[model samples]
Target: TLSSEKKAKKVRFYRNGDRYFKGIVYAISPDRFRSFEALLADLTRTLSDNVNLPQGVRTIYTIDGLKKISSMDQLVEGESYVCGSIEPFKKLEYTKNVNPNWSVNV
Candidate 1:
């Protein structure tokens, strides 16, 4: 039996060749808010502090990993996505231009 904390941290890891991807739990929302950005930042910070991902494992954040959908209309409750690696961090640079205080949500 897994401890509560370990069970909570348990994530599904998907691998393609040498790269592994894992979905980290983030926030949920009825309507996306600006404050959600802060929530994401905190989640990422917690993950960084607690989990030890395998080296070279890259993370890719997307809405269902679909390249086309970008609007909120596509989002569904209990639906979550993977935000892997530093790529999303790089993208955050662009987002920060629009919302300077924006940060990753887990």
Candidate 2:
């Protein structure tokens, strides 16, 4: 009834200045969220718990690779990925654009 171990999802995060970051995701938790913001929170929280993030902080995320990346598939089961944490938490929403090239470079 068992087979080889599952593969971990590779996730990428991008913040201001067009900066790029990477991480390996083993799983996602909280099961469900009421809104997109909640989704980011859940993902980042899960990531922070399993891995050591940049600056040793909990703030990385992604748009999966479905509608945005076009290179990765969306959550298949218990795994997850892309994007970084937004400290301001003002106008930014989970549904917002996550294109790294679109990072606020100025």
Candidate 3:
């Protein structure tokens, strides 16, 4: 059972420069035999196809105990987890002048 304190939450989106990222939270069984990496890849592909994922953008998932590859303990059954895109931030130029401290003196 999912703990009252750790219920499934709504997904969140973040915007950096001109790009956007999305994420979702869900609950999974602790003894599930699913691979987190595979799941993330599948989700990414799906979201990319349906949503407006940035070009050449990548997806990533973050969970409590599903990060490691050699974890014997299974995830908590019915517990919620989070997954989102590790969207890249677009690089931008702040200024054209390359000076330490140049100011117009009147």
- Please state the error at residue 102 of candidate 3 in Å: 52
Kindly give the stretch of ten consecutive residues in candidate 1 with the minimal lDDT sum.
93-102
Is candidate 2 or 3 superior in lDDT? 2
* lDDT for each residue of candidate 1 in 33-89, tens digit (9 for 90 to 100): 234344345445544432432233345344344442234333333343344443332
What's model 3's overall lDDT? 0.33
Q: Sort the predicted structures by TM-score, highest score first.
A: 1, 3, 2
Per-prediction TM-score, please? 0.33, 0.26, 0.29
Candidate topping lDDT: 2
Task: Supply candidate 2's per-residue lDDT for 32.
Answer: 27
Candidate 3, superposed: residue stretches over 4 Å from native:
1-23, 31-33, 54-57, 61-106
Which residue pairs show backbone clashes in model 1?
A: 40-104, 40-105, 44-106, 59-84, 59-85, 60-84
Query: lDDT of all predictions, in order shown?
Result: 0.34, 0.35, 0.33
What is candidate 3's lDDT per residue for 1-106, written digit by digit as tens? 3343233222221222322333333333333324556544554554454344534224332233234223313333322223334454333221223231211110
RMSD of each: 13.6, 11.7, 15.1
TM-score of 1: 0.33
Residue 63 of model 1 has an lDDT of 39
